[PDB]
Amino acid sequence: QISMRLYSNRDRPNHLGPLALERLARVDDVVAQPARQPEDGFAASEDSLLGDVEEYARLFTRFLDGPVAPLGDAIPDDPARRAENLKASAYFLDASMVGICRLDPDDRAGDCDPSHTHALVFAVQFGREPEAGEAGAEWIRGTNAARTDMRCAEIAAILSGYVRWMGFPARGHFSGDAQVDLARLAVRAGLARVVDGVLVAPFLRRGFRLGVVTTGYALAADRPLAPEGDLGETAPEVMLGIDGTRPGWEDAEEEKRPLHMGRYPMETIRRVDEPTTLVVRQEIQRVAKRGDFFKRAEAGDLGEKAKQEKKRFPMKHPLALGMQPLIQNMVPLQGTREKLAPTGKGGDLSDPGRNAEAIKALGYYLGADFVGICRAEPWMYYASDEVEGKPIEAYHDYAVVMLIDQGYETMEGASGDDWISASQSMRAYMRGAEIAGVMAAHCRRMGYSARSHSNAHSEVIHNPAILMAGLGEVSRIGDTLLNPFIGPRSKSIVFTTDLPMSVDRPIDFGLQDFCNQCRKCARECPCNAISFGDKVMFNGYEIWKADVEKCTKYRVTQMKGSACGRCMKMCPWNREDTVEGRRLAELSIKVPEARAAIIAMDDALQNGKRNLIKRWWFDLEVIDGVAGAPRMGTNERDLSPDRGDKIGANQKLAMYPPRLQPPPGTTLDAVLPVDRSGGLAEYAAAETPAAARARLKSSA
Ligand code: B12
Ligand SMILES: O=C(O)c1ccc(O)c(Br)c1
Ligand code: SF4
Ligand code: SF4
Ligand code: NA
């Protein structure tokens, strides 16, 4: 695979994006002319996704405008900084291309707010579609504009809400609900030119759709593209992406892989029938959802401060607040548990192997980074819900598991526990829930029960589904599985369904031996919650059990950031998507003799250091509905020194298997103070995986 960037973007600020837009011919003004956005080249049937992406577009539309917070005294004045931060925000949310332009009278003369002076214009590129005759082509053909419009409305809604929380009135616009001329503003903002009355954007050869945020929050404006002639898209500096931008050949190369195979070469990873760590199904107890340690925090199980902060701790930052409406209001759409009657829509559904390819292709078309399929085994479902305490049924046969990359470049400039951490969680959560909600809907359209499991509402535990779907291995981080290509830098989304699909197999890329020689995540955890010792048996399976009490307490309670994810950032597998980055992963997998060296040089080269160029976000904590400067400061952590050579023997963590959890049926209205002394003793008594294998063998 030769599409990886040759050159690093480590010195490229995020407001510049992944495309070398700063190398295109531009001029101060251009004469406006009629233009429409690109459209599909075919129509969509009743077999098609179309109805579902339109529903979610309509849902996001109700968050294009909303309440405006009081103006604090911490919002930077400089329009240039405002421009970069908002541009970077849009790229964070996966805009393909971003620009800014000034609104003039003719725009404010419509239903648009008359106090609006500037427009943030962004484009999202059409998704890749299955080739004719491929599995799922009928589900997708003709849905690209609506599909891309949904994504635009999403981003517009988040960004508009983001500015509104900084105290500035703002309004999102897209084809489905726009008060301004979208095409006209895209040309003025320098994203596109006009060919035969249709917009044409450089680099976005697949087509695109637009979104816009109009606001009185003043921004530095960009300049339109040179109206005629070659823009320089194929100049040598741009073709090779010398500044760390998308190579000029990557599109043509990527488009040679079948869409259902995803972008990362998972087909090259070794497969095994059973996971690389022991799983003893007959010994795995199901856990009350009330045993979720956030649910425990919420009920008072972890003290009053954890209970107080449980609601706000991930919403301290205005960007995450812009995502909350979408997150919470997608929940009522997650799907059904009852059996459905196959409706005859969706084409030929008799080949489970073709069904899996269509589902994977469908996920990648919608924005997933990884798709895997496994059976939703009953021990993967929670025993009981946390609100009413009623039993949860194992109501679906299959689990579709998708990984959303949390974002390398943002995490590179962060501490892992500063004011953007929860925003990296919530973005991946918001994006996965959207994609999974759309896919479950389509399954239900075809007459196959399906329900998604999101951050706001899940009835399965994602982890074992990530394992069985072959998307990660057990890693030292504990409650996080590690993928060979994006390491631990992910949020998973799962949706269960009865749609017959061929399942994937667990993967084996050598991580057990690698984590056995590595301690970086454990060394860098601010509250020492990650284990330095051997794997233990836990509720019937082998795992590195982190101390989930200490982690929960720190994420909900620490006041120099919003939550934490520092362990993802520090892991050596958290790497840039470069030629040398992939090769370091390749070597880690194929050359065991080189692992110790890679683990050491990761420190010697100061990997994990904060890259100040990538720190694009504002430090804003919302207190009493008003964004202000962080009341207590901001985490700015740097590489830490070794703990003892004896820390694996001395560190003592608490574990909470079902025995030390709220029993099935317990609700949030009961309180069960965390029995830490019992969790410490429990951990000391945990069977070692070696003893479990001996014990199982004696009944084989
Ligand atoms: C609440 C919660 C936490 C809590 C508490 C978890 C807990 N154990 O109580 C803390 C602990 C606060 C937490 C921490 C983080 N977690 Co969290 N956690 C959750 C959440 C929402 C609940 C887990 C749960 O069901 N209850 C707790 C009970 C079931 O815990 P348990 O009995 O000890 O079992 C745990 C593990 O043993 C594992 N597991 C259970 N059965 C089996 C069986 C096998 C064979 C294996 C291998 C594993 C496994 O799953 C449980 C995860 O907590 C899930 C989301 C979800 N719906 O699953 C994620 C989730 C697992 N965590 C996730 C992440 C990303 C994080 C963080 C990195 C935060 C961040 N910035 O992203 C940190 C890392 C923590 C670490 N050191 O590993 C991701 C992991 C994805 C992945 N790639 O593996 C999840 C899946 C959310 C998601 N949608 O992606 N979060
Ligand atoms: O319930 C919450 O507040 C919550 C749930 C999931 C999650 O990843 C985070 Br961060 C917070
Ligand atoms: S284990 Fe928890 S507290 Fe420690 S670095 Fe990871 S997210 Fe932060
Ligand atoms: S930091 Fe090292 S030990 Fe921790 S998960 Fe990553 S590779 Fe494994
Ligand atoms: Na790293």
Numbering used by the authors: -2 to 697
According to the publication:
The RDases are cobalamin-dependent and able to selectively cleave carbon-halogen bonds through reduction. The RDases can be split into two classes: (i) the canonical respiratory dehalogenases, which use a halogenated compound as a final electron acceptor during organohalide respiration and (ii) the catabolic respiratory dehalogenases that occur in the catabolic pathways of non-organohalide respiring bacteria. Structural insight into RDase function is based on two enzymes that have been crystallised, the respiratory perchloroethene (PCE) Sulfurospirillum multivorans reductive dehalogenase (PceA), and the catabolic reductive dehalogenase from Nitratireductor pacificus pht-3B (NpRdhA).
Only one conformation provides a halogen beta axial ligand and thus resembles the 35-DB-4-OH substrate complex (occupancy 30%). The 3-B-4-OH bound structure reveals this is likely due to multiple conformations, only one of which appears catalytically competent. Indeed, inhibition of NpRdhA reductase activity due to inhibitory substrate binding modes likely accounts for the higher Km and lower kcat seen for this substrate in comparison to 35-DB-4-OH.
